[PDB]
């Protein structure tokens, strides 16, 4: 076997037992890795279990691409049954943990059970131990990693959670190298429910590559393509921050709980501003186009800014000062909590206050008030903090504010307001893990322009794009697993991947073979949601926030415009027609059979009638 | 006598003698104050003196508006025969030292001679002493003021010099309240040559006011007008920083030693960027539209930004990040040196390195190298820091680089590139104190738009608008002396100034009275220049830098466009005709008499032939 190790390190914090699981090569080829392997493991190992119970599984899934020097391939997936959604949840992050874990002889690491007290996992090649972390508990992500490296050395990849993860804040994430995060659906709160404070990994093994010479050839070639791309220079200057002005220009910038798509103070939180405030630039391993743009916040503190962070914690909260937003950014990072859901849950809170629905809390534009709630959310201090820490879906059920509850399947919506963007809306509506732009960033194609540089329509070809995009973004790249920005941003050729995959694993994959795996992973994940939801499922699960229907843009040429329920629904059907799912959103026996997923049928058959 | 005290404080550092000179009421009425009063003094007392010798007079001249609550009337002028230009030089700065000086019973303070050791002047009403400052010498202006306040309390006005003054950097200035500055022509280098480290003032006296009730009402009315003007909200947001975009939009932004009028990275150093980097806002005494905007620099240090600082230290140096320009900004402030002349002297070096004339030194964009040269200049470290500390005119004489020496009369050009702006060019060419935009910021009128929100022409009416602007900017406002911005930026009616003066001094000044007074100040100063230049003088002293005539814009639709000498010469002649000067730029006998300057004629007649 080449590329894959075919080994999965298993760590039980309840029994303290550490073993290595050897899975079949066919399963490697079948799911390639990352989200694929993760999906495979959760179907089998996380059946009907509570997301915060010790029976849940936390998976750090890598891919054949990881551990080896491949263009921006130092990513990693973190999965487990989500405490936020209740279905499948996963995330990605660039970190040396990815390089060191695969070089330590593992394709993934699964963690079950829960420690009786705070602990951290230590992994150095074949030496794996569960050590006491009693002294780290309570510390920020930054400090935790720093102290651990002060002990073991700089040559280790470190994964940690902050108080937010510790206090089981619903959308807690996992952090690495101060800035890289993973797991919006609550991978951090799962890690936290297990009293697992961190993970330190060190690898030195030589990974078996089928064709060594071709890997160096392809990689070296892919880098140069990236370096000479016309988009390199600008990317290097603004990274994802360049979407701020772009989204404002297109009325897609979420402002005050997605109320409007235009923020009057975009310019003071935009990319050029970020540029004149940049003091450092970091990146994930093996990437020659770093986009970890670090600035100094309002308190002179370093803060790594990303578009999604600035949009949900900036324009979305009515705060138009980068130095200030950056302060909220840094807090989410050290507390270990998703910028998007945090910024969305606080925005939700801000509107309920202006509506007089909530007696107290910060309102739009209140920076100091927002900073306070964020910290209270992290430490779950106060009734409000404890509520906003549960996400907008849950918080809304309690308050009775589903009107402006911006989520899908439980997960809070990203930074693209789709009042007049059907394909993007459908992308949020169908995301495999809940509202997120990860899998289908169709908005750029839907408009015709891109940040690196209009008529509404529900043409059923839009659904086709989403599906095609999902296959690559929420599929191929979430399985290799590698960064998709070299392609999405500077236009690196997608041909390098099938060729690199063959140079590594020695297996030849046709783009059609890959689409199948991606479509396979999507039907298995959907299957998971259904099984876990106990057959309680219908096409509405795939619906965008009601607000994109009953309300409209509040300014500009498209003032008053929005999405239409009928045409959206008709577009959902096209999506289901292309995926092979029934009108309920569930795969059909022919599709499950067709995708090598027969074992799923009897199981879904036990919860509902299949088609 | 009302308004004026008719009293001037005299301190002789050499002999230590301290007295109070009484000056006539026609002298006050005649010259009103500030710059008016300073010119009368310099003409009489700084005859033939070495700008850096003990005989030179350091004047701190206030006016009828100072010491009283007048709209943004907390200004003060600093004058002396200039060390950089060799002619009449002066500056203006907002400082509590303006209020306290007048509340102590003085209209102005005149330091002469030279202390035998570091000393500072202490003033508290009638108690005036020359104290030892031996423990202060060497410390930054910021630190000097903080330390003195820790001793005498916060309720005082402090004026200081930094090591640039101490070391006699030719464009050394006087600083106050970290940020406020005065004296581009080297007032700080004169303060330093006297071994004078600071001046602490405190006043408690009540100033005689002709009409107490009117002054109140007029002031209350002026502030509200400011508060309600449409441009107020935006002025509060960007201050003078709004001039970067607007200047870039008009090809007026000095870029790489005035090489171009456009900067490709202007955005990351603009008012919107600044806006999102703002942590504090300060202002001068008695102003309800504060504009001292404080940002955090690349090093986390507070920096007070003003358009001119960012233009000559940013885009002019080819440095496109605002946090890095702010760093250079802070250095200027704490070292006590004019941001403008420092930036121009540096850009000149940068262009000199690039062209290979200089074998060592920084280049455009080299922030680290510019910061080092800036510190090397303040401390006069090395042949380079030493040459640069002399200004571009002197530096150019040494390097033989007259071609890209951006100065007029020895004083370096401001933040407005005039390849295609004949009025502004005439403004710099005729500025009383040498190149500056203080007296005539005509560029806005010439374009038809202003920052608070094209065909080249040499219409002789342009020479009229300059003279008109000078009467107000380089006259009325430097004599009162009050801030011009409330009128210039938000548009406060200029009609409050003649009424307020009247309500304070009791005298009725009509606009023609003011135009005559300002004109007197202009002919007197020119007189000073000619006399001190020993009759060696001609129209070329009023010419803009050669670069704008033999080179043109390098980009945009005006690419290649430049200024026509012949047509400019004609514009200058219209200027001399209007002012009543000969084709040599020297006042005409009939003109002097006309302005009550007969006493100038016998004196000038000793060096040249009058007309
Ligand atoms: O700006 C974003 O959040 C998305 C960047 C492009 C991508 O998702 O691939
Ligand atoms: O932007 C500047 O430097 C000038 C502001 C307007 C004025 O000079 O009055
Ligand atoms: S482009 Fe950005 S997210 Fe992608 S690998 Fe490079 S630094 Fe990481
Ligand atoms: S407008 Fe600015 S410079 Fe003028 S008095 Fe006010 S704070 Fe000072
Ligand atoms: Ca980040
Ligand atoms: Ca200043």
Tab-separated table of N, CA, C and O in Angstrom, chain A residues 237 245 265 267-268 270 272-273 275-279 296-300 321-323, chain B residues 237 245 265 267-268 270 272-273 275-279 296-300 321-323:
chain	number	residue	atom	x	y	z
A	237	UNK	N	-1.240	40.390	-0.611
A	237	UNK	CA	-1.508	41.638	0.083
A	237	UNK	C	-2.744	41.582	0.968
A	237	UNK	O	-2.686	42.003	2.113
A	245	UNK	N	-14.702	44.480	0.451
A	245	UNK	CA	-15.142	45.491	-0.497
A	245	UNK	C	-15.979	44.824	-1.576
A	245	UNK	O	-16.983	45.375	-2.018
A	265	UNK	N	-19.732	51.401	6.624
A	265	UNK	CA	-18.364	51.554	7.101
A	265	UNK	C	-17.506	50.377	6.676
A	265	UNK	O	-16.652	49.912	7.418
A	267	UNK	N	-15.244	50.341	4.282
A	267	UNK	CA	-13.887	50.834	4.102
A	267	UNK	C	-12.943	50.789	5.308
A	267	UNK	O	-11.743	50.568	5.127
A	268	UNK	N	-13.462	51.001	6.524
A	268	UNK	CA	-12.622	51.002	7.732
A	268	UNK	C	-12.378	49.616	8.347
A	268	UNK	O	-11.745	49.494	9.398
A	270	UNK	N	-12.062	47.026	5.799
A	270	UNK	CA	-11.755	46.328	4.562
A	270	UNK	C	-10.307	45.866	4.432
A	270	UNK	O	-9.517	46.011	5.364
A	272	UNK	N	-7.691	46.979	2.468
A	272	UNK	CA	-6.630	47.984	2.373
A	272	UNK	C	-6.293	48.447	3.757
A	272	UNK	O	-5.140	48.727	4.072
A	273	UNK	N	-7.323	48.522	4.585
A	273	UNK	CA	-7.155	48.936	5.961
A	273	UNK	C	-6.313	47.872	6.649
A	273	UNK	O	-5.298	48.178	7.276
A	275	UNK	N	-4.282	45.948	5.404
A	275	UNK	CA	-2.922	46.055	4.875
A	275	UNK	C	-2.068	47.055	5.651
A	275	UNK	O	-0.952	46.741	6.055
A	276	UNK	N	-2.588	48.265	5.838
A	276	UNK	CA	-1.852	49.285	6.569
A	276	UNK	C	-1.737	49.012	8.058
A	276	UNK	O	-1.150	49.798	8.793
A	277	UNK	N	-2.291	47.885	8.497
A	277	UNK	CA	-2.277	47.468	9.898
A	277	UNK	C	-1.547	46.138	10.065
A	277	UNK	O	-1.477	45.606	11.162
A	278	UNK	N	-1.032	45.586	8.980
A	278	UNK	CA	-0.360	44.298	9.039
A	278	UNK	C	1.036	44.379	9.627
A	278	UNK	O	1.835	45.218	9.225
A	279	UNK	N	1.329	43.497	10.576
A	279	UNK	CA	2.646	43.456	11.198
A	279	UNK	C	3.300	42.098	10.984
A	279	UNK	O	4.482	41.916	11.284
A	296	UNK	N	-2.305	44.353	14.492
A	296	UNK	CA	-2.277	44.711	15.906
A	296	UNK	C	-3.681	45.247	16.169
A	296	UNK	O	-4.153	46.134	15.451
A	297	UNK	N	-4.359	44.703	17.175
A	297	UNK	CA	-5.697	45.160	17.490
A	297	UNK	C	-5.693	46.464	18.300
A	297	UNK	O	-4.633	47.037	18.584
A	298	UNK	N	-6.887	46.932	18.656
A	298	UNK	CA	-7.044	48.178	19.407
A	298	UNK	C	-6.262	48.227	20.710
A	298	UNK	O	-6.099	49.291	21.292
A	299	UNK	N	-5.792	47.075	21.174
A	299	UNK	CA	-5.059	47.018	22.425
A	299	UNK	C	-3.622	46.667	22.175
A	299	UNK	O	-2.936	46.194	23.071
A	300	UNK	N	-3.170	46.917	20.945
A	300	UNK	CA	-1.795	46.633	20.567
A	300	UNK	C	-1.427	45.157	20.524
A	300	UNK	O	-0.246	44.820	20.468
A	321	UNK	N	-14.701	49.400	12.725
A	321	UNK	CA	-13.326	49.764	13.058
A	321	UNK	C	-12.518	48.474	13.210
A	321	UNK	O	-12.713	47.721	14.164
A	322	UNK	N	-11.612	48.230	12.264
A	322	UNK	CA	-10.804	47.013	12.242
A	322	UNK	C	-10.052	46.712	13.532
A	322	UNK	O	-10.040	45.573	14.002
A	323	UNK	N	-9.419	47.732	14.101
A	323	UNK	CA	-8.668	47.540	15.323
A	323	UNK	C	-9.539	46.969	16.431
A	323	UNK	O	-9.074	46.164	17.251
B	237	UNK	N	-14.452	62.296	11.758
B	237	UNK	CA	-13.961	60.978	11.384
B	237	UNK	C	-12.533	60.966	10.808
B	237	UNK	O	-11.673	60.246	11.312
B	245	UNK	N	-6.809	60.498	-0.211
B	245	UNK	CA	-7.592	59.992	-1.330
B	245	UNK	C	-7.814	61.110	-2.345
B	245	UNK	O	-7.457	60.973	-3.513
B	265	UNK	N	-0.391	52.576	-3.671
B	265	UNK	CA	-0.769	52.015	-2.373
B	265	UNK	C	-1.374	53.032	-1.401
B	265	UNK	O	-1.426	52.814	-0.195
B	267	UNK	N	-4.279	53.678	-0.610
B	267	UNK	CA	-5.370	53.206	0.230
B	267	UNK	C	-4.957	52.746	1.624
B	267	UNK	O	-5.632	53.054	2.603
B	268	UNK	N	-3.860	51.996	1.720
B	268	UNK	CA	-3.406	51.492	3.009
B	268	UNK	C	-2.749	52.566	3.878
B	268	UNK	O	-2.132	52.260	4.898
B	270	UNK	N	-4.587	55.787	4.037
B	270	UNK	CA	-5.583	56.838	3.898
B	270	UNK	C	-6.495	57.038	5.100
B	270	UNK	O	-6.411	56.296	6.083
B	272	UNK	N	-9.528	56.311	5.732
B	272	UNK	CA	-10.405	55.207	6.118
B	272	UNK	C	-9.578	54.182	6.841
B	272	UNK	O	-10.054	53.509	7.759
B	273	UNK	N	-8.334	54.044	6.407
B	273	UNK	CA	-7.438	53.115	7.062
B	273	UNK	C	-7.204	53.709	8.452
B	273	UNK	O	-7.423	53.041	9.451
B	275	UNK	N	-8.925	55.737	10.154
B	275	UNK	CA	-10.175	55.622	10.900
B	275	UNK	C	-10.343	54.312	11.652
B	275	UNK	O	-10.924	54.286	12.737
B	276	UNK	N	-9.854	53.223	11.064
B	276	UNK	CA	-9.969	51.917	11.695
B	276	UNK	C	-8.766	51.568	12.553
B	276	UNK	O	-8.649	50.448	13.050
B	277	UNK	N	-7.878	52.542	12.718
B	277	UNK	CA	-6.661	52.401	13.507
B	277	UNK	C	-6.690	53.435	14.641
B	277	UNK	O	-5.711	53.584	15.377
B	278	UNK	N	-7.812	54.147	14.771
B	278	UNK	CA	-7.958	55.192	15.783
B	278	UNK	C	-8.298	54.704	17.186
B	278	UNK	O	-9.275	53.975	17.374
B	279	UNK	N	-7.499	55.133	18.165
B	279	UNK	CA	-7.711	54.745	19.561
B	279	UNK	C	-8.023	55.961	20.442
B	279	UNK	O	-8.556	55.828	21.551
B	296	UNK	N	-2.511	53.585	16.544
B	296	UNK	CA	-1.468	52.774	17.170
B	296	UNK	C	-0.544	52.497	15.995
B	296	UNK	O	-1.017	52.159	14.919
B	297	UNK	N	0.760	52.650	16.174
B	297	UNK	CA	1.669	52.411	15.065
B	297	UNK	C	2.084	50.934	14.944
B	297	UNK	O	1.582	50.084	15.678
B	298	UNK	N	2.972	50.620	14.007
B	298	UNK	CA	3.396	49.232	13.820
B	298	UNK	C	3.954	48.646	15.102
B	298	UNK	O	3.857	47.439	15.327
B	299	UNK	N	4.536	49.508	15.936
B	299	UNK	CA	5.129	49.088	17.202
B	299	UNK	C	4.201	49.208	18.400
B	299	UNK	O	4.655	49.118	19.528
B	300	UNK	N	2.910	49.407	18.150
B	300	UNK	CA	1.935	49.498	19.223
B	300	UNK	C	1.906	50.816	19.966
B	300	UNK	O	1.162	50.960	20.943
B	321	UNK	N	2.248	51.376	4.006
B	321	UNK	CA	1.510	50.852	5.164
B	321	UNK	C	1.384	51.978	6.188
B	321	UNK	O	2.369	52.619	6.514
B	322	UNK	N	0.185	52.214	6.707
B	322	UNK	CA	0.005	53.327	7.638
B	322	UNK	C	0.609	53.150	9.019
B	322	UNK	O	1.046	54.128	9.628
B	323	UNK	N	0.635	51.917	9.514
B	323	UNK	CA	1.201	51.648	10.827
B	323	UNK	C	2.715	51.891	10.820
B	323	UNK	O	3.308	52.206	11.864
